[PDB]
Paper text:
Group 1 contains the name-giving family member, steroidogenic acute regulatory protein (StAR/STARD1), and STARD3. In the StAR group there is a similar ion pair between the β–strands, namely, Glu169 and Arg188, which is not found in other family members that bind cholesterol. Arg188 has been suggested to bind to the hydroxyl group of cholesterol and it is also present in PCTP and RhoGAP groups. All structures reported are relevant to disease. They are down- (STARD13) or up-regulated (STARD5) in cancers, mutations in them result in metabolic disorders (STARD1) or they are linked to obesity (STARD14;).
Steroidogenic acute regulatory (StAR) protein related lipid transfer (START) domains are small globular modules that form a cavity where lipids and lipid hormones bind. The concave face of the β-sheet and the C-terminal α-helix enclose a hydrophobic cavity that can accommodate lipid molecules. Here we present crystal structures of four human START domains, those of STARD1, STARD5, STARD13 and STARD14/ACOT11.
Author numbering: 64 to 173, 177 to 276
């Protein structure tokens, strides 16, 4: 039947789709990206200075594993993704709204870069054959910043799972990343870290799959 939503919810709901459309729009704009890395596995990391946001990172990786498996392992079981991933210490779902959107507190581990956590809303939609994780830093007053860890913010961040052009057994994972670490960190160093952060996620992801 019909369900009703508090204005605060609808707020998060909007954000859940504002983050999605804007991140997809950054992928729709195909050509224009520079290149940051090129792996032995054919893994790629593109970059671009978006007017609205700023310098973003686009991870180009394909995996020799079923798509739906990556789904449950990446979202349905994301709370425990802190196990097979060193770059993250603890991820906790603060609240689920409706079917797609939900707010999370992602606490990532640091040794020259100070520890940083995140409180963001994220939408897990799928047009059937293609699943996609959206998200962006949200304001969850019911979980303010704690002493010790610095609250960094996420820009329009998406992640697309697409069955291989000619192989259902394979999946093309496209991960557009946008973050504002919000430290005093130099401009240069921020680039390489966010890049390797992506290349690492790809590695650990493949390893978990086994």
């Amino acid at each position: 039947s019909m369900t009703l939503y508090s204005d605060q919810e609808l707020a998060y709901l909007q954000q859940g789709e504002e983050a999605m459309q804007k991140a997809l729009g950054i992928l729709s704009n195909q050509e224009g990206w520079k290149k940051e890395s090129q792996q032995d596995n054919g893994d790629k990391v593109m970059s671009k200075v978006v007017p609205d946001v700023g310098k973003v990172f686009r991870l180009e990786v394909v995996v020799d594993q079923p798509m739906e498996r990556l789904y449950e392992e990446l979202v349905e079981r994301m709370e425990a993704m802190g196990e097979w991933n060193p770059n993250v210490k603890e991820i906790k779902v603060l609240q689920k709204i409706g079917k797609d959107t939900f707010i999370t507190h992602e606490l990532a581990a640091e040794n020259l870069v100070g520890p940083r956590d995140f409180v963001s809303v994220r939408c897990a939609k799928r047009r059937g054959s293609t699943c996609v994780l959206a998200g962006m830093a949200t304001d969850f007053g019911n979980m303010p910043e704690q002493k010790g860890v610095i609250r960094a913010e996420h820009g329009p961040t998406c992640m697309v799972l697409h069955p291989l052009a000619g192989s259902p057994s394979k999946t093309k994972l496209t991960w557009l990343l946008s973050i504002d670490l919000k430290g005093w960190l130099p401009k240069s160093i921020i680039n390489q870290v966010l890049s390797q952060t992506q290349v690492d996620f790809a590695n650990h992801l493949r390893k978990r799959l086994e």
